[PDB]
Design a protein around this nucleic acid. Structure first.
Lengths: 158, 100, 263, 206
RNA sequence: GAAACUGCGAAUGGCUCAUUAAAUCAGUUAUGGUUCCUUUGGUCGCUACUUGGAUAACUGUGGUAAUUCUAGAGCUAAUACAUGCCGACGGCGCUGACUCCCUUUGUGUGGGAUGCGUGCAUUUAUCAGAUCAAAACCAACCCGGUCGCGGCUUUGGUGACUCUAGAUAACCUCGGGCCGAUCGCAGCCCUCCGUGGCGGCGACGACCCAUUCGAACGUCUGCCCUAUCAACUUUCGAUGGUAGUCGCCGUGCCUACCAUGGUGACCACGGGUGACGGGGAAUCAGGGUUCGAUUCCGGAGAGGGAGCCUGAGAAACGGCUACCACAUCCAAGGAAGGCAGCAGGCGCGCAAAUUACCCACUC
């Protein structure tokens, strides 16, 4: 919040510039930084916390340098010990045709999760879309979070 | 003037190899002692250094200034007809012709 | 290994609609690089040797072309494997005849003779719209033609008409409901009907629904629809059978009843 | 030789993989430019598709922008002072993208003083009056002083730059890739970027 | 019209199945993360009535036991190699000596001597991108009118761009971006007697868009036997973050600093395979079992490993350099080599054809 330059190099959004002319503000002041953000398409909506926020993240869909294309998928949040990335589980049934019967299977995906989502928990349901390769094992990025079709965080009044 | 020669075993001398021995060099298009059979070809082959010794099969020499005496046949014989020029400015430069 | 581009074509690998025999040979003509895709053209040698039968061998085709007799879109072509395709005109001024390439309702190029005043124009589908330096607008067609200064009402998926002596636009048809079209790919290849609905998806493929003269209904991806007339009437003459696609039982019954094929 | 392939290294599970084929030419890599400060030395390389690429070994001069004033000019490069990635790059004076450098202030000072009709880099009267006062004051019929309110009411520079101009050097940041473009080229440090790197420079050695 | 120089092709075709178990391969999708000879269509006006020197074929003289080995001497060309005008600057922005009019300045004007930059590509920085709901005061005015009221305007496109087009300040590659010192057929029209040109048909060439043929990298789901294989990976990069280098481009691809991650009983990790994958083949009431080196499609490799030149395209083997295993000739100094192409031979083994004819057909 109050400081974000925790790295050895200065952190800023590309395409935003601050004028060093007409700088007078009197006894008070206003934000020296305007905010860059965009529409993703496909009927998704941009979070309020991306527009009203102050974080820097180049891999963010709403406020960074990525294009959402190809497949849209969903899965269950299962681990989150990395920084700005999480692991999600996908479960399915496989048909074996000699018998007339099914077999249970799973796979894991590592995905990139930006700030603007900040109340996610293990067992939440998440929707993701493809990007260019973002790191060695990461190809997908979080577009929406939900806990519909399931029990509450704490008691039923949540 | 000393213009080159051949070793025993027939290997040629080449300029810039500063020894009396023979050596093996990786030759390429534009060097002497090699003629490429394909575009971009290079081959490694034997050549003799620049220094003159008793070992050579033959020395090549060219007369750079004549004496007063005549050497038989070599300096008596008058020049042949050669072949004439073919580029237009070359013809003008030979006969001192005007631009018109 | 594959260290660069290939330059041969095996005869069992060649496009099915050319109708090549099984036993004369191992190879087929590889179409020359050009305005139409390898799967979607007819090489000029297959038209002169196998369709029109003016030549018995590839050498008899070579010595027809080198005499400068053959024109495609009004230009003389000496290349025997040149990739001719849909809506092109071929003219043979020495025999006095003109052709246009159009699909038969079984999904293959028909021979279709035309009158010399209809051999003066062709129909083109729009592929792209863009702006170049100094703000000049550009157009691109399904057959690689580039046009400067198009009319600002001409949009994506529309059909334009061009005169072949000058290469400039004369008139156009908008893509909208109720206009006549022909199908140029998939299983419905070579059918004709009116556009009746367009269903759209953001990402992936749009789907068009089309209605027949006999009231049948069929659908395809938007990339396979070519518009050929404002409302009910086409801007080009059409081959025998007019795109109606009768079933194998109707085709049996007409073949018995009409006694055609020298019965 | 050197190569940039994905198949020489292990999968998500920690398991090995065996080689699928010999090294291909499209997997190639090449040694680094390691560009120094010094009089121009550039070399060129042929690249995939037959195109050309430019590699700078020595550079003495660059192009820099003072974005606050809309002024850019060709300028001498003096020294390197900070590098976020590795300290051996400043110890050996190597020039790379997002490196921090010192540049000659003169062409910006000459633009400002002739545009605003005011002094900038000056200490005392002995470096104002004896020559070049005729850049500042001349005959100007109906353009003499009050019509320069279009200039004078917006002339004041930031205190952090007025302290740099008196020493004859400005801090700047490299924006081009010198080992790929053949050019060293960028922008003048200002505002909170200038506060950030002045704190980092002082906290390292001072 | 021999030879020789220059251009293009030789990266396709043909042969084999050793390696290879989420690898290859199949169906499905993506480049809004790249490159692209040729074809086809756009585009092609910021000494000059024609420049420079120098080699091959050829002529002439040689060296070595020996090879598609080559040296010294005398001549001469270009669409090879290297220079470089003319024509059509008349741009439009910024400076502003002076000058004229209402109002000494400021502020509204119209002229204007004189300088500087001024095509498309290239590197970096900055600017603008127009549209929506409702009134009331004040400075100064567009405008209909005069000393307070009506009424408005400006590239294109996608589901989505830090897209395309536009404006400003500089850079620029040079020896190291473009804008023709080239070749062949028929001749012409004239302040016109062989002159000023303008022009008909081409041929070849080159920077940049778009095509065509592709190539490369990535998404989702799919595999034979094994526990006498239960835990594995990890600055010797393992999983992730920030900045950079390298590369045609995305990316631990690699480097510095930091974090402590990632996979497994829904079988990881390890071992085996007389394992190249698929279209397919034999047998078969219904359900199945077994096979697929082999003419079509994809991959890999030219005795075994490694490195690299040329080019649009190769880590090429009918290209080159070296080590390792074989092996041919010699005057013992040296030189030359790769049939898992077609015929043919030896060895192996139960086990497999002629050292024939032709470009007539298909390409």
């Amino acid at each position: 919040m109050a400081d974000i330059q925790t790295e050895r190099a200065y952190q800023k959004q590309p395409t935003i510039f601050q004028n060093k002319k007409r700088v007078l503000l009197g006894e008070t002041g206003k934000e020296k930084l305007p905010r860059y953000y965009k529409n993703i398409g496909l009927g998704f909506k941009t979070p309020k916390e991306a527009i009203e926020g102050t974080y820097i993240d180049k891999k963010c869909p709403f406020t960074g340098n990525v294009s959402i294309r190809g497949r849209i998928l969903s899965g269950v949040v299962t681990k989150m010990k990395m920084q700005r990335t999480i692991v999600i589980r996908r479960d399915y049934l496989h048909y074996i045709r000699k018998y007339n019967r099914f077999e249970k299977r799973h796979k894991n995906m590592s995905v990139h999760l930006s700030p603007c989502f900040r109340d996610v928990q293990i067992g939440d349901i998440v929707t993701v879309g493809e990007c260019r390769p973002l790191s060695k094992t990461v190809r997908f990025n979080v577009l929406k979070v939900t806990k519909a079709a399931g029990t509450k965080k704490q008691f039923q009044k949540f | 003037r000393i213009s080159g020669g051949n070793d025993k075993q027939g290997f040629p001398m080449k300029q810039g190899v500063l020894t009396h021995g023979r050596v093996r060099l990786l030759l390429s298009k534009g060097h002497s002692c090699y003629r490429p059979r394909r575009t971009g070809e290079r081959k490694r082959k034997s050549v003799r250094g620049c220094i003159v010794d008793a070992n050579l099969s033959v020395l090549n020499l060219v007369i750079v200034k004549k004496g007063e005496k005549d050497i038989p046949g070599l300096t008596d014989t008058t020049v042949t007809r050669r072949l004439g020029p073919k580029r237009a400015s070359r013809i003008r430069k030979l006969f001192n012709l005007s631009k018109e | 290994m594959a260290r660069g581009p290939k330059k041969h074509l095996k005869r069992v690998a060649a496009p099915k609609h050319w109708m090549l025999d099984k036993l004369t040979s191992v190879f087929a003509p590889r179409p020359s690089t050009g305005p139409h895709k390898l799967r979607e053209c007819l090489p000029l040698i297959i038209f002169l040797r196998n369709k029109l039968k003016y030549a018995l061998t590839g050498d008899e085709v070579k010595k027809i072309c080198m005499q400068r007799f053959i024109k495609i879109d009004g230009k003389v072509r000496a290349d025997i494997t040149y990739p001719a395709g849909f809506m092109d005109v071929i003219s043979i001024d020495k025999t006095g005849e003109n052709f246009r390439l159009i699909y038969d309702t079984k999904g293959r190029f028909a021979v279709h003779r035309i009158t010399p005043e209809e051999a003066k124009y062709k129909l083109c589908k729009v592929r792209k719209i863009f702006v170049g330096t100094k703000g000049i607008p550009h157009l691109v067609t399904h057959d690689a033609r580039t046009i400067r200064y198009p009319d600002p009402l001409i949009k994506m998926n529309d059909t334009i008409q061009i005169d072949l002596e000058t290469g400039k636009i004369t008139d156009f048809i908008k893509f909208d409901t109720g206009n006549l079209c022909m199908v140029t790919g998939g299983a419905n290849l070579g059918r004709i009907g009116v556009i009746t609905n367009r269903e759209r998806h953001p990402g992936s493929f749009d789907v068009v629904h089309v209605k027949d003269a006999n009231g049948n209904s069929f659908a395809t991806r938007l990339s396979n629809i070519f518009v050929i007339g404002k409302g009910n009437k086409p801007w080009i003459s059409l081959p025998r059978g007019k795109g109606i696609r009768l079933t194998i039982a109707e085709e049996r019954d007409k073949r018995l009843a009409a006694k055609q094929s020298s019965g | 030789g050197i190569s940039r392939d994905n198949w020489h290294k292990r999968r998500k599970t920690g398991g090995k993989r065996k080689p699928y084929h010999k090294k291909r030419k499209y997997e190639l890599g090449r040694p680094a430019a390691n560009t120094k400060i010094g009089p121009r030395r550039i070399h060129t390389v042929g690249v995939r598709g037959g195109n050309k690429k430019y590699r700078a070994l020595r550079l003495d001069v660059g192009n820099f922008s003072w974005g606050s004033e809309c002024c850019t000019r060709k300028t001498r490069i003096i020294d390197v002072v900070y590098n976020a990635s590795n300290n051996e790059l400043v110890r050996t004076k190597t020039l790379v993208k997002n490196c921090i450098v010192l540049i000659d202030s003169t062409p910006y000072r000459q633009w400002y003083e002739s545009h605003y009709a005011l002094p900038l880099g000056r200490k005392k009267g002995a470096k104002l009056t004896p020559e070049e006062e005729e850049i500042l004051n001349k005959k100007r019929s109906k353009k003499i002083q009050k019509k320069y309110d279009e200039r004078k009411k917006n002339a004041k520079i930031s205190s952090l730059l007025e302290e740099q101009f008196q020493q004859g050097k400005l801090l700047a940041c490299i924006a081009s890739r010198p080992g790929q473009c053949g050019r060293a080229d960028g922008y003048v440090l200002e505002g909170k970027e200038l506060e950030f790197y002045l704190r980092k420079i002082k906290a390292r050695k001072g």
